[PDB]
Design a protein around this motif. Structure first.
Motif, short mmCIF file in Angstrom:
data_model
loop_
_atom_site.label_atom_id
_atom_site.label_comp_id
_atom_site.label_asym_id
_atom_site.label_seq_id
_atom_site.Cartn_x
_atom_site.Cartn_y
_atom_site.Cartn_z
N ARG A 60 32.62 41.15 52.68
CA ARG A 60 32.12 40.11 51.78
C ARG A 60 33.11 39.75 50.68
NH1 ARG A 60 26.97 43.52 50.68
NH2 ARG A 60 27.01 42.87 52.88
N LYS A 61 34.27 40.40 50.62
CA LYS A 61 35.31 39.98 49.70
C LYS A 61 36.26 39.01 50.38
CE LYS A 61 34.02 43.41 46.96
NZ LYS A 61 32.60 43.88 47.08
N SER A 62 36.79 38.10 49.58
CA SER A 62 37.88 37.24 50.01
C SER A 62 39.07 37.47 49.10
CB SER A 62 37.45 35.77 49.98
OG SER A 62 37.44 35.35 48.63
N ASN A 63 40.19 36.83 49.44
CA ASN A 63 41.42 37.01 48.68
C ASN A 63 41.20 36.78 47.19
OD1 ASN A 63 43.01 37.75 50.80
ND2 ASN A 63 43.45 35.63 51.35
N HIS A 64 40.52 35.68 46.82
CA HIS A 64 40.40 35.38 45.40
C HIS A 64 39.49 36.36 44.67
CE1 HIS A 64 36.78 33.20 46.90
NE2 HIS A 64 36.27 33.60 45.75
N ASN A 65 38.82 37.27 45.38
CA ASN A 65 38.06 38.29 44.68
C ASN A 65 38.96 39.38 44.09
OD1 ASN A 65 35.65 37.68 47.15
ND2 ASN A 65 35.29 37.34 44.96
N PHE A 66 40.26 39.37 44.39
CA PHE A 66 41.19 40.36 43.86
C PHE A 66 42.09 39.73 42.82
CE2 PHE A 66 40.09 41.55 48.15
CZ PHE A 66 39.64 42.85 47.96
N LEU A 67 42.02 40.25 41.61
CA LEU A 67 42.89 39.82 40.53
C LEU A 67 43.97 40.88 40.38
CD1 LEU A 67 43.57 38.08 38.00
CD2 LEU A 67 41.75 39.32 36.82
N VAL A 68 45.21 40.50 40.68
CA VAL A 68 46.37 41.39 40.64
C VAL A 68 47.30 40.89 39.55
CG1 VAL A 68 48.33 42.29 41.90
CG2 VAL A 68 46.18 41.86 43.11
N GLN A 69 47.55 41.73 38.54
CA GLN A 69 48.41 41.33 37.44
C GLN A 69 49.63 42.23 37.36
OE1 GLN A 69 44.48 41.06 35.35
NE2 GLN A 69 45.73 39.92 33.86
N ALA A 70 50.80 41.60 37.28
CA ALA A 70 52.08 42.27 37.06
C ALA A 70 52.59 41.86 35.69
CB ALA A 70 53.09 41.91 38.15
N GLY A 71 52.52 42.78 34.73
CA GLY A 71 52.77 42.41 33.36
C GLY A 71 51.92 41.23 32.95
N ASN A 72 52.58 40.14 32.54
CA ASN A 72 51.91 38.90 32.18
C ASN A 72 52.04 37.85 33.29
OD1 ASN A 72 50.16 38.34 30.11
ND2 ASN A 72 51.69 37.37 28.77
N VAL A 73 52.04 38.29 34.54
CA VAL A 73 52.08 37.39 35.69
C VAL A 73 50.95 37.79 36.64
CG1 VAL A 73 53.41 36.63 37.70
CG2 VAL A 73 54.55 36.96 35.46
N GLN A 74 50.10 36.82 36.98
CA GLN A 74 49.11 37.05 38.02
C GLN A 74 49.77 36.89 39.38
OE1 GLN A 74 45.27 34.98 39.87
NE2 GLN A 74 45.42 34.63 37.65
N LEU A 75 49.53 37.85 40.28
CA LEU A 75 50.03 37.74 41.65
C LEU A 75 48.97 37.11 42.55
CD1 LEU A 75 51.91 41.08 42.42
CD2 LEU A 75 52.77 39.00 41.20
N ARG A 76 49.38 36.16 43.38
CA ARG A 76 48.42 35.47 44.23
C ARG A 76 48.23 36.28 45.51
NH1 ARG A 76 47.46 30.60 47.70
NH2 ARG A 76 49.69 30.51 48.24
N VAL A 77 46.98 36.64 45.81
CA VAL A 77 46.66 37.44 46.99
C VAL A 77 46.43 36.51 48.17
CG1 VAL A 77 45.05 39.10 47.98
CG2 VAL A 77 45.65 39.25 45.57
N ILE A 78 47.15 36.74 49.26
CA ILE A 78 47.06 35.89 50.44
C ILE A 78 46.55 36.63 51.66
CG2 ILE A 78 48.86 34.34 49.63
CD1 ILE A 78 50.82 35.72 51.38
N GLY A 79 46.25 37.93 51.53
CA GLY A 79 45.71 38.70 52.63
C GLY A 79 45.20 40.03 52.14
N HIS A 80 44.20 40.60 52.82
CA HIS A 80 43.73 41.92 52.45
C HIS A 80 43.29 42.68 53.70
CE1 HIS A 80 40.09 39.43 52.56
NE2 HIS A 80 39.43 40.53 52.88
N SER A 81 43.53 43.98 53.70
CA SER A 81 43.02 44.84 54.76
C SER A 81 42.95 46.26 54.22
CB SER A 81 43.88 44.77 56.02
OG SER A 81 45.20 45.12 55.72
N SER A 121 49.86 50.12 33.55
CA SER A 121 50.92 50.49 32.63
C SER A 121 51.02 52.01 32.50
CB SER A 121 50.69 49.88 31.23
OG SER A 121 50.74 48.46 31.23
N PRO A 122 52.23 52.56 32.41
CA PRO A 122 52.38 54.02 32.33
C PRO A 122 51.87 54.63 31.03
CG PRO A 122 54.53 52.86 32.36
CD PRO A 122 53.48 51.84 32.08
N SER A 123 51.12 55.72 31.17
CA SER A 123 50.83 56.58 30.04
C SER A 123 51.84 57.73 29.91
CB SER A 123 49.40 57.12 30.17
OG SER A 123 49.11 58.02 29.10
N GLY A 124 52.45 58.17 30.99
CA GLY A 124 53.43 59.25 30.91
C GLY A 124 53.75 59.78 32.29
N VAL A 125 54.63 60.78 32.32
CA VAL A 125 55.11 61.35 33.58
C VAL A 125 55.08 62.87 33.47
CG1 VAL A 125 57.54 61.07 32.86
CG2 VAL A 125 57.01 61.35 35.32
#
Lengths: 305, 9, 305, 9
Positions: A60-81, A121-125
């Motif tokens: 019941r999910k589609s691609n647009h149900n996933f919000l993927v953020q890289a820093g201040n850039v949203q990544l567009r999801v074009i497939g899921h499995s 974002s990293p909290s530590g290592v």
């Protein structure tokens, strides 16, 4: 000199962390090439984590149900499995910071570095070992799932762990990067428990070698023993059996120090039966088992990346 | 206590 | 849950690490903007180790006697000067990877992450504390000088330590990034000894609070103490005196746990009297003093950078 | 022992 719980440098992994949000559920993802990997339980709402049907939840999910953020850039999801317990979100841009990498599955007793993250974002290592009971003694909070464990070799990052969940004793469970769990655990919040753990014998030996390399030589003794006689003792104190393979791997350390492994095994035997006598080794009043022989060699020979 | 999947809300 | 000796993510500092060679002597430098900072004893030969006159050694060198390598790229040195025990090599290119940074001098008891390097390349990252006797208990080999210690403030790196030398007990000494040594140590190989070290009390208490936050209370007791009676007892165990500022610093952990600072002081007095009687606290059989109150909050809350 | 300045040769 000195001996510390040393993690790998984390910059190569830092450039791969993103945030994945599905509904009101958020965790971390790992962005390599044009794919983001994350735990499949990101598709759970708060109320379905008891007995989720991941197939049905994902259909019941589609691609647009996933919000993927890289820093201040949203990544567009074009497939899921789904691959086992990991979601693979195909995105439309390949990560330009993708390092040379491999996915590897490790064995109990091996160590790795964890980059703990929240909201991508990293909290530590810090440095972990895969326990013999397949748990990890991590430091993880709500939101940390999708953080990864790794080792570096030259310029190649070997990804070995992705974090999923915390067990009632406060230890942690997760998968390899193909979504296969380490240990007999499942990604749901029905009753589960870590089994009895044991101490990683070959690693303690590696650690005593590190101590001798650092001049902590008081536990050395004029005694000797055999592999067979040692293992009778170790088994009593809940140590893993020491195998001939373990002896071979302890070779470069025994060669560098001038102490034979079974001589070191003799000292370990005396340490188990009589204790440390109020003394410490390398700043610890416990026998440390989360350094492999290679961790010792890597640290005391200053191997770089 | 029960296991917790360690996403956030 | 869980609690680990956690270092800061190292990526931003990795991008500043270079190699500096003068003659047959090599170590690491820190490249920020168009300046490379490095320990001044790179200008020493094997014959200049006991009583170097660095002003004299430096006046005999020209810009081209300093070979600076950033990965596979040689940087052209166009200027050099000495500031206390560090050299500043001006180069003809600003480091494109320079983060937001500051230079800070820390106090004994404060913690930092060390990025251990050789030949300008990272070997590993670990967490350290400036000891009360102004040494650090690091892990450093020949060639590690010029490795730095740091803290992160979201996106700003505060460099607090540059590594210079190892003392005969196997602990380490270095400078701030203005080249002023921590402690009364000097960069020559004549006889030098760390003074008697003490335990960082405010940090042990913070760590005890971390134990409570992680669900463990077995070590508390029904007593309280005056600050002065606490310090009269703790100092017999070679613990640093606790000041009122320390008490103020612990306010937030006190408030979160409902344990008054002087009541946790009473617990500490008993733990020192009794030991742990076969128990461990956050996986240790010793009282750990290299976590500050801020380190605790950061790891138990999930602060990221 | 004596202190060691930790460059490399």
């Amino acid at each position: 000199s000195g001996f510390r719980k040393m993690a790998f440098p984390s910059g190569k992994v830092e450039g791969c962390m993103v945030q994945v949000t599905c509904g009101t559920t958020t965790l971390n993802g790992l962005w390599l090439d044009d794919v983001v990997y994350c735990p499949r339980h990101v598709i759970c709402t708060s109320e379905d984590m008891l007995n989720p049907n991941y197939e049905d939840l994902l259909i019941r999910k589609s691609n647009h149900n996933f919000l993927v953020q890289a820093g201040n850039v949203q990544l567009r999801v074009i497939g899921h499995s789904m691959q086992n317990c990991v979601l693979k979100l195909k995105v439309d841009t390949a990560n330009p910071k993708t390092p040379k990498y491999k996915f590897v599955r490790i064995q109990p007793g091996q160590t790795f570095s964890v980059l703990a993250c929240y909201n991508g974002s990293p909290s530590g290592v810090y440095q972990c070992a895969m326990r013999p009971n397949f748990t990890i003694k991590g430091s993880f909070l709500n939101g940390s799932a999708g953080s990864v464990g790794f080792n570096i070799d030259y310029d190649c990052v070997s990804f070995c762990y992705m974090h999923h969940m915390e067990l009632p004793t406060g230890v942690h469970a997760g998968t390899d990067l193909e979504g296969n769990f380490y240990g007999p655990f499942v990604d749901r919040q029905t009753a589960q428990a870590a089994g009895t753990d044991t101490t990683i014998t070959v690693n303690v030996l590696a650690w005593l070698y590190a101590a001798v390399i650092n001049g902590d030589r008081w536990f050395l003794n004029r005694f000797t023993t055999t592999l067979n006689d040692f293992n009778l003792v170790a088994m009593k104190y809940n140590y893993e059996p020491l195998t001939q393979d373990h002896v071979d791997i302890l070779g470069p350390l025994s060669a560098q120090t001038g102490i034979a492994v079974l001589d070191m095994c003799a000292s370990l035997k005396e340490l188990l039966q009589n204790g440390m006598n109020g003394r410490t080794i390398l700043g610890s009043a416990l026998l440390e088992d989360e350094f492999t022989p290679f961790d010792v060699v890597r640290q005391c020979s200053g191997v770089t990346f | 206590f029960y296991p917790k999947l360690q996403s956030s809300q």
